[PDB]
Structures are given as structure tokens and as C-alpha cells.
Structure 1
Amino acid sequence: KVFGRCELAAAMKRHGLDNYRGYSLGNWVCAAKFESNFNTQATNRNTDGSTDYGILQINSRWWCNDGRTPGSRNLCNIPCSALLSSDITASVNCAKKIVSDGNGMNAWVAWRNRCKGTDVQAWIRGCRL
């Protein structure tokens, strides 16, 4: 599924991401835009052999099991395929575990480089929330 901007904002708010660990909703929408272009089916392979999955590009070396990343830790206890669903529940629940780790949203490269320190409120402006 390719989400609309406000449609995704509304889903993320329902699932409790607005101000989760202090990150306002615009931060999460911005991250999703630049990680996946709002596409739940996005995948990207890394040089170390791991793969990033879904709307928030969660990585198979630490967070989910895809059966082909030796030494995966599967800290979210899910198959990586579950992160490609049109239902973003599993991605949100796993993202909550990731952002509670020491580095916050700096774990997402696209957030650090394209959203941090910008006007992220713009990503939810106009939306009925």
C-alpha cells in the first residue's frame, strides 16, 4: 500500500506515535516519506547483506528475521515480511522499540539527514487529525 500523507499521519496517531518518546507526529511522517516514499512494500538491500523492510525501513540484522541475514538478533520477534503489510501495526510496534534505544530517531538515516532540524510540522499541515 502507498499511503497518502494525511492518511498515514492519521494511522500513526491512532497507533500512539504522536509525541512517542518526545517525537511529534511530523517527525514520523517525515521519516516515512524519505525512508520509503510512504510505500509499505519497500525493500532495500545493504552491503552487509541485511535488508531494510517496509514504511520505516527496519533492518534485518537487528530487528526482524528474514531467513537470510546470518547473526540476525530479531529483537522485534517478527518475520520481516510482516513489516510489508498494508496494516502498519507491526512496523509501528517495532519502531517503538527502536526509538526507545539509546539514539532515538537518529537510528533512521533519512530522518537524521532530511528531517532533523527542519520544519517537520509541515508534514501534517492541512490534515484532519
Structure 2
Amino acid sequence: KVFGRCELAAAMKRHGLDNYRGYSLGNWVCAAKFESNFNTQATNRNTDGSTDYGILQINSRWWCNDGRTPGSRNLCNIPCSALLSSDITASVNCAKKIVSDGNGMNAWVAWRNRCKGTDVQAWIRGCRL
């Protein structure tokens, strides 16, 4: 699924991501934009042989099992394929674990490089939430 901006904003809020670990909804929508362009089916191979899955590009190195990331972990206890679903429940659940790991949303390098410190509220502008 390619979510609309406000569509994804509404979904993230429903699943309790708005102000989770103190990160406003605009922060999460911005990370999704630059990680996946709001595409649930987005997959990207990392230089280390791990892969990034779904709207928030969750890495197989730590968080989900894809069977081809040697010496990895599955801390969200889910197949990475679950993270490509049109239903973002699994992605959100797992993102909550990631953002709680101690570096907040810096875990998403695209959030650090493209969202952090910016006017993230723009991403929820015009949305009925």
C-alpha cells in the first residue's frame, strides 16, 4: 500500500505513535516519508547484508527475521515480511521497541539527517486527526 500523508498520520495516531517516547506525529510521518515514501512494500538492502522493511525501514540486523541476516537478532519477534503488510500494526509495534532502545528516533538515520530539528508539524498540516 502507498499511504496518503494524512491517511498514514491517522493510522499512526490510532496505533498510539503520536507523542510516543515524546515524538510528535509529524516526526513519525516525516521518517516514513524519507524511509519508504509511505510505501508499506519498500525493501532496501544494507551494505552489511541486512535488509530494511516497510513504511519505517525496520532493519533485519536487530528487529525482524528474514532468514538471510547472519548473526542478526529478531527483537520484535516477527518475520520481516509481516512489516510489508497494508496494515501497519506490526511496523508500529516494532517501531515502539526501536525508539525505546535508548537513542530515540536517531535509530532512523533518515530521521536524524532529514527530519530532526525541522518543522515536522508541516507533515500533519491540513489533516483531520
TM over 0.5: yes
CA drift at 1:72: 1.4
CA distance in 2, matches of 1:23, 1:6: 17
Work out the CA distance in 1 between the residues paired with 2:36 and 2:57: 7
SS in structure 1 of the partner of residue 34 of structure 2: helix
TM-score with structure 1 setting the length? 0.99
**Could you report, residue by residue, the CA deviation over 1:41-61 in whole angstroms, capped at 9, with x for unpaired residues?**
000001110000000000001
Deviation at 1:26, TM superposition (A): 0.2
Structure 1 residue 21, shift from structure 2 partner = 0.6
- 1:54-73 deviations in whole A, cap 9, x for unaligned? 00000001000000001111
Equivalent runs, 1:26-37 vs 2, <5 Å: 26-37=26-37
Instruction: Give structure 1 regions of 4+ aligned residues with deviation exceeding 3 angstroms.
Output: none
In 1, the alpha carbon distance for the partners of 2:128 and 2:46 equals 37
Question: How many percent of aligned residue pairs carry the same amino acid?
Answer: 100
Structure 2 stretches lacking a partner, 5+ long: none
Cα displacement string for residues 70-122 of structure 1 (whole angstroms, at most 9, x for unaligned residues): 11110000000000000000000000000001100000011000000000000
Runs of 5+ unmatched residues, structure 1? none
* Corresponding residue SS for 1:52: strand
> Cα RMSD between the aligned structures?
0.4
Give the Å deviation of 1:123.
0.2
Cα distance in 2 for partners of 1:115, 1:46 equals: 21
Cα distance in structure 1, aligned partners of 2:94 and 2:114: 22
Residues matched between the structures, number:
129
